[PDB]
Design a protein around this ligand. Structure first.
Ligand code: FES
Ligand SMILES: [Mg+2]
Ligand SMILES: [Mg+2]
Ligand SMILES: [Mg+2]
Ligand SMILES: [Mg+2]
Ligand SMILES: [Mg+2]
Ligand SMILES: [Mg+2]
Ligand SMILES: [Mg+2]
Ligand SMILES: [Mg+2]
Lengths: 97, 100, 137, 86, 50, 20, 39, 78, 122, 111, 97
RNA sequence: UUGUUAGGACCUAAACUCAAUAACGAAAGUAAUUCUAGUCAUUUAUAAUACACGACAGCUAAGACCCAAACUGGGAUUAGAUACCCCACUAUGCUUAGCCAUAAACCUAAAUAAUUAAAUUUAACAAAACUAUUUGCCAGAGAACUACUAGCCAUAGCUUAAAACUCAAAGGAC
């Protein structure tokens, strides 16, 4: 009929979905340096997923690892260890104005 | 006579592929204060702001360079059964095209 | 080469000294700011009491005992007692969230003491004791 | 009670600006939600009321974000009239 | 094939398991070499071991 | 509206009567 | 139903009003001494 | 509604992922405009008519042919 | 199954620390275990002050012991280690390596409309 | 009790037919892959397989009514052992009574 | 009700079959000619303000009428009150928009 | 008594942030940590006179007891306070064994498989509509979550559930 008619196919130009910072990375309770990047420096409170930027799965993984680390004598509870204050910033939170 | 299906396949707009982060040439057809209305060959025009450098050069008929983002700005909002369109395109004016 | 809001880390070497004292040595001003009375106690870094004051001891009574100006007087009174004992720099640990929480710290400054840091120790239970029932008014 | 004292919830005064230190400590304790927690924990909120309150906040936050999105989506179309006289 | 390989891998790994004979020697090797599980990520998702 | 109030008021008068 | 819900287009008094006035003042003063309401 | 996808789009998608959009700007007012990407697809087709069956072979050979033509193709991973 | 022990030990000199790790690992073997690896993480300051056996501790030596044991031995091991006077805090968990990092494509956009079907009902 | 209980030296169902082929395997490796270092769930997969061989004509098929009945007898006897220790577990007491009733329904269709 | 006329969706932008457009446009132009031939009144109607002056200039060139402004309620259903007792309504309305 | 304690003891009770999450369970219900046990295939719908469960409050017995708190006492308030507010304190909330079987036990939606067009706002409002299958249930309101009856560890209890008589309405959504 017509050679120029469009051909059914999956979108070639499809854009890959957006991954979180921890996508496909092991989250362990002993890696307190990674865990400390998602708590508050002053209170030690876990940040929500609107701050950490994580997905549901990794948000739950970090939460379960911080609590296990805190309960097994690896991580503090009421603050962030001063030795990890220098690590990079991944969380969308600015205490200073 | 060429068929419509052939025309669409070989059309410059069909060749562009996705219009995000593409480079295109536009023409200024309407100016309102420091807002330039630029036709880049699509359905909807874009509207950019006159650059501080060489502001006087951007007059009507002047061909410029653009970085497309969307061909039409549209978005569905809560409680809407159809998309809300502002009947405008999104592009970033980069500067005048060298006549050469 | 910038100021750090975070306090010095205990057990490390720092260049920050106040009146030839390290951070761990600077005396502590314990402010208990409740909704009725604001108490203040100043202690040395070895936990020895030096000054004490409160809105009640100043002479305020009942609802006046729980105002901002009442706590300010208590801080100025605690400062004067502390200044006599030989205290120039204090670490302010403010427990409680009452009306004279800030005013007590402002009185201490007016009394001639130099605050170098402000800590908060308001009790926050992690799940704890059932609070009293809501008031119906 | 078992942790180290003066690391948690401690700000440092810069150049004797004792008020600025306190005002920053307040912004910290509020951003972290400790302020609301201490206020609400004065009296007992019953489990049924806590769930009603949290469901309302979530729906309130969703509606305030979408309405802001609609206003910000049409922020650019608010410009000088190009077709004045028509 | 997969299960045969998995069994063989465990057999090779079992060479270096601890036993009563090599307990004290393996204890001293562990004390000599500390290990670290700490690492951090950037906003780009890149590990940053120190 | 008045139907639960009436069940309540009717139920209230039965519990009082049972007590007497 | 969110849009429907949140559009929302459609001597006793003397002693009671001496307690609400005092308490509301006590409470609103505390609200404004923190960033809780707003910065 | 049929999604309009021609067979050239498979080639065009690879070109945009490997080299991005040609540094020359698209002119959508010229009805017969030939972009750098459309020339890549015209040469890629010619080689495929000869009978090359490997997509990798057709992608690197077309790049060499355009390099001889003088077109500046930058393999921008960024 | 495969379990990872997390053994915080009292801060001691190497002679006594080595004796503590020999006595400990021997107990695992006596309970029918197959010890696979021993790792040290170093002496450090505890995140908080842990009180064990009528002594307050601020520093301890962190160690990991990878091993296999029946499901019935896990409880007996923890009971024995809790009675040891050189053990600040023993914690047995299922070995992390037995758990495999899942494969994720990405975050698919969720329409808020299908979140007000979720949240309005809640 | 029942006539057959899997020995502790038996290999798990994944490696039941793989280790015999391997020429030589260490005692430790056999012990890691035995039923001593496995969960109770693994020991139940061996009990079921033993019964399927001894009863079903074609043990390869597990969708037959006779095979489904065998699957529920292992679960039923498992829930009973659970309930002998957890006397006040009401979720598992329900699981036991619902499987018993399920087995009766399947035995009725088979008959 | 427009899906019959849409050739397809080119990466989010619906494309309009120009073969149906030619057939429909032929009928519409033929009908517009017979109406104009018989001396009927033709009213061009649009509310797009970019093309308000162009459409008013076109109507004047043709010899017909244009209404590109705010449309009063009742203009056609209550025309006698608005325009007069014997006002003749349009015989054809061309909606550019 | 108070404040401080980087002093000691206790291991009672409850589980911040995470949670802007929407998972698990038949429902009730369930989110401190770890480990053990553990949810799984009947084609699908359809069950009581049987079996097993069932928030909170309450009963029985032995314990626990930080805090909260019916009742009770004290203080104030008011023409009166038998309440609201303040202080003290008990049953009770907890554990171990039973019992009781009640909720606006509500998503005020029986389950299951369809379809989205039948020119279906087929009242309105909720939650778009609608077909088929099977069971349960309903037939004006009040009298009546009542009387009597039978069953039940329930004894001021629960489930089951009328009539006389009265009215011309009751009721629902806007
Ligand atoms: S987006 Fe892949 S794990 Fe978070
Ligand atoms: Mg307890
Ligand atoms: Mg298990
Ligand atoms: Mg009591
Ligand atoms: Mg409900
Ligand atoms: Mg009842
Ligand atoms: Mg009755
Ligand atoms: Mg009866
Ligand atoms: Mg009747």
């Amino acid at each position: 009929s017509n050679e120029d008619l469009p051909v059914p196919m999956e979108n070639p130009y499809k854009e890959p979905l957006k991954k979180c910072v921890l996508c496909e990375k092991r989250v362990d309770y002993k890696n307190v340096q990674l865990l400390s990047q998602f708590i508050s420096p002053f209170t030690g409170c876990i940040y929500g997923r609107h701050i950490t930027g994580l997905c549901g799965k990794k948000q739950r993984e970090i939460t379960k690892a911080i609590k296990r680390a805190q309960k097994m004598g690896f991580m503090p509870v009421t603050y962030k260890d001063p030795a990890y204050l220098k690590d990079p910033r991944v969380c969308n939170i600015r205490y200073r104005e | 006579v060429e068929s419509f299906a052939s025309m669409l396949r070989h059309s410059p707009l069909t060749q562009l592929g996705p219009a995000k982060d593409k480079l295109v040439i536009g023409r200024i057809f309407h100016i309102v204060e420091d807002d330039l209305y630029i036709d880049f060959g699509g359905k909807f025009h874009c509207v950019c702001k006159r650059p501080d450098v060489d502001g006087e050069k951007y007059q009507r008929g002047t061909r410029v360079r653009l970085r497309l983002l969307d061909l039409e700005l549209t978005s569905r909002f809560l409680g809407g059964t159809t998309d809300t369109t502002i009947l405008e395109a999104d592009a970033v004016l980069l500067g005048l095209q060298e006549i050469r | 080469s910038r100021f750090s809001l975070y306090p010095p880390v205990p057990g490390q070497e720092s260049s920050l000294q106040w009146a030839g004292m390290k951070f761990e040595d600077v005396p502590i001003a314990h402010i208990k700011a409740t909704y009725n009375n604001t108490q203040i106690q100043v202690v040395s870094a070895t936990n020895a009491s030096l000054a004490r004051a409160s809105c009640g001891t100043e002479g305020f009574r009942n609802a006046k005992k729980g105002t901002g100006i009442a706590a300010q007087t208590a801080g100025i009174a605690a400062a004067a007692k502390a200044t006599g004992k030989g205290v120039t720099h204090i670490r302010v640990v403010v427990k409680g969230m009452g009306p004279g929480r800030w005013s007590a710290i402002k009185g201490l400054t007016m009394g001639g003491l130099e605050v170098i840091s402000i800590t908060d120790n308001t009790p926050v239970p992690h799940x704890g004791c059932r609070p009293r029932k809501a008031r119906r008014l | 009670a078992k942790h180290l004292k003066f690391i948690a919830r401690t700000v440092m005064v810069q150049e004797g600006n004792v008020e600025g230190a306190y005002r920053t400590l307040n912004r910290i304790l509020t951003t972290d939600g400790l302020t609301e927690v201490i206020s609400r924990r004065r009296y007992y909120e019953k489990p049924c009321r806590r769930r009603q309150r949290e469901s309302y906040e979530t729906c309130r936050r969703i509606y305030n974000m979408e309405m802001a999105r609609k206003i910000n989506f049409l922020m650019r179309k608010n410009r000088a009239d190009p077709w004045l006289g028509c | 094939q997969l299960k045969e390989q998995e069994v063989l891998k465990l057999q090779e790994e079992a060479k270096n398991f601890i036993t009563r004979e090599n307990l004290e020697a393996r204890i001293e090797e562990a004390l000599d070499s500390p290990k670290s599980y700490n690492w951090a990520v950037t906003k780009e998702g890149q590990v940053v071991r120190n | 509206v008045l139907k639960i109030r009436r069940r309540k008021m009717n139920h209230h008068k039965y519990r009082k009567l049972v007590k007497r | 139903n969110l849009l429907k819900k949140f559009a929302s287009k459609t001597k006793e008094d003397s002693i009671r009003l001496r307690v609400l006035n005092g308490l509301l003042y006590k409470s609103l003063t505390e609200l404004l001494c923190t960033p809780q309401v707003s910065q | 509604i049929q999604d309009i996808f021609y067979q050239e789009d498979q080639i065009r998608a690879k070109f945009f992922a490997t080299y991005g959009s040609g540094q020359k700007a698209f002119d959508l007012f010229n009805p017969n405009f030939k972009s750098t990407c459309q020339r890549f697809v015209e040469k890629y087709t010619e080689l495929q008519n000869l009978g090359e069956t490997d997509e990798e072979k057709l992608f690197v050979e077309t790049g060499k042919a355009l390099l001889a033509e003088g077109i500046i193709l930058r393999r921008v991973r960024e | 199954p495969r379990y990872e022990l997390a053994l915080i030990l009292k801060a001691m000199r190497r002679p006594e620390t080595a004796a503590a790790l020999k006595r400990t690992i021997e107990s695992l073997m006596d309970r029918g275990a197959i010890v696979r690896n021993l790792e040290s993480l170093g002496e450090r300051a505890l995140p908080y002050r842990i009180s064990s056996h009528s002594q307050q501790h601020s520093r301890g030596g962190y160690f990991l012991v990878d091993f296999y044991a029946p499901t019935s031995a896990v409880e007996n091991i923890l009971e024995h280690l809790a009675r040891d006077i050189d053990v600040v805090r023993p914690n047995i968990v299922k070995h992390p390596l037995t758990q495999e990092v899942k494969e994720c494509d990405g975050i698919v956009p969720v329409p808020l409309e299908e979140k007000l079907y979720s949240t309005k009902r809640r | 009790k029942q006539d057959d209980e899997p020995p502790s030296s038996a290999f798990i169902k994944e490696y039941k037919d793989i280790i015999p082929n391997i020429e030589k395997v260490d005692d430790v490796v056999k012990r890691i892959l035995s039923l001593e270092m496995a969960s109770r769930k693994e020991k139940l997969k061996i009990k079921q397989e033993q019964l399927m061989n001894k009863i079903v004509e074609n043990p390869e098929d597990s969708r037959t009514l006779e095979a489904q009945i065998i699957a529920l007898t292992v679960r039923i006897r498992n829930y009973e052992e659970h309930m002998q220790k957890h006397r006040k577990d009401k979720a598992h007491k329900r699981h036991l009574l619902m499987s018993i009733d399920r087995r009766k329904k399947l035995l009725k269709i088979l008959r | 009700f427009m899906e019959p006329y849409i050739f397809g969706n080119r990466l989010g932008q619906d494309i309009i079959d120009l073969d149906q457009t030619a057939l429909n446009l032929q009928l519409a132009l033929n009908f517009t000619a017979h109406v104009a031939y018989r001396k009927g009144i033709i009213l061009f109607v649009s509310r797009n303000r970019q093309f308000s002056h162009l459409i008013e200039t076109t109507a004047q060139a043709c010899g017909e009428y244009a209404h590109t402004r705010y449309f009063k309620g009742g203009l056609l259903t209550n025309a006698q009150l608005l325009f007069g007792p014997s006002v003749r309504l349009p015989d054809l309305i061309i909606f550019l928009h």
